[PDB]
Amino acid sequence: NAIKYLGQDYENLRARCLQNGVLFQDDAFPPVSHSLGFKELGPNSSKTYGIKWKRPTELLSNPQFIVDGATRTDICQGALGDCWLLAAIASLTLNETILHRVVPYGQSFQEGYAGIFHFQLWQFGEWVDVVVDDLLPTKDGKLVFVHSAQGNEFWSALLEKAYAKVNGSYEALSGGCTSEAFEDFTGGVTEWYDLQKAPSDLYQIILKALERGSLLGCSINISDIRDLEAITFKNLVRGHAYSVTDAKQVTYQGQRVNLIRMRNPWGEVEWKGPWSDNSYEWNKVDPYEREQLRVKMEDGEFWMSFRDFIREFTKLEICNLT
Ligand SMILES: *[C@](=O)([C]([C]C1=[C][C]=[C][C]=[C]1)[N]C(=O)[C]([C][C]([C])[C])[N]C(=O)O[C][C]O[C][C]O[C])C(=O)[N][C]1[C][C]1
Ligand SMILES: [Ca+2]
Ligand SMILES: [Ca+2]
16 A cells, blocks of 8 residues: 655545535645745746636536546646656556546535545655545646546646655656656656657557557657747647557558557647548548547547658667566
């Protein structure tokens, strides 16, 4: 059983709050500016000034911890530089077992609610249970940071808060390494691949990792700084963590083509090249494959051929489990 971060005891705190007729407020990560940050989110910063801390039970009549499962569409980045963390959470959702280690069952805004939630992370070389109160940064009634495509769903917001907690503040999550979040969700072994020097069996390596529920992410290095724009001509985001979410082979004009699926943690802004949602390539695969694989939605998720993937992206990270 996970050891308690800082000795904070989720069930004890919950039961005592319920008995005392109050909602939990977390002394270890309180609803004040120092939990937001120190510079860009510091006490005197423009961003801090516009934020008010509110519980989901203050925002909505019917807040829900999980709605239609804890899935990758639940991860929509807000106004924070934590794409790396969010790419990792989105990948985490594809492995049911590890997902629900990190996100324990039995948490609700109804029976037994007392304004406290908990999550398990691999931290300090231990599996640790981290509590948070459910006060969340908001502006004009909406979450400022991560939110779900399902507007009344809060598990991912609360998880991002717990991860901020262990790192000291939300601002502490601005800029990072996808593999660091991968490790913090698994205790696993991380490896990376230079896509410009990809081994000839990389696609098989990817297939196998996805099969076993390993976590995969990818990115495009900015080799100049940003003097060819943050976004590429074909609508990829440079210096930005994507989750790799599938790998499947289609029959394109009678010939197998290896495809790879990825997801922008923004929940929007997608590749517009071959195999993109509106591309013509889909017209030349058999309708069953097209229907299984293609989803015409601005949801941040899209396909690329593996060929185009290894040309466009520069880095692949894989976190392998037990
Ligand atoms: C991601 O794209 C962020 C944007 C970002 C924010 C703050 C600083 C730098 C970049 N991208 C990253 O965090 C990238 C992700 C990798 C390419 C996978 N990390 C990175 O460039 O490493 C920087 C090192 O910083 C670590 C400092 O630790 C002390 C994003 O969140 N984008 C949305 C804001 C638009
Ligand atoms: Ca959901
Ligand atoms: Ca899409």
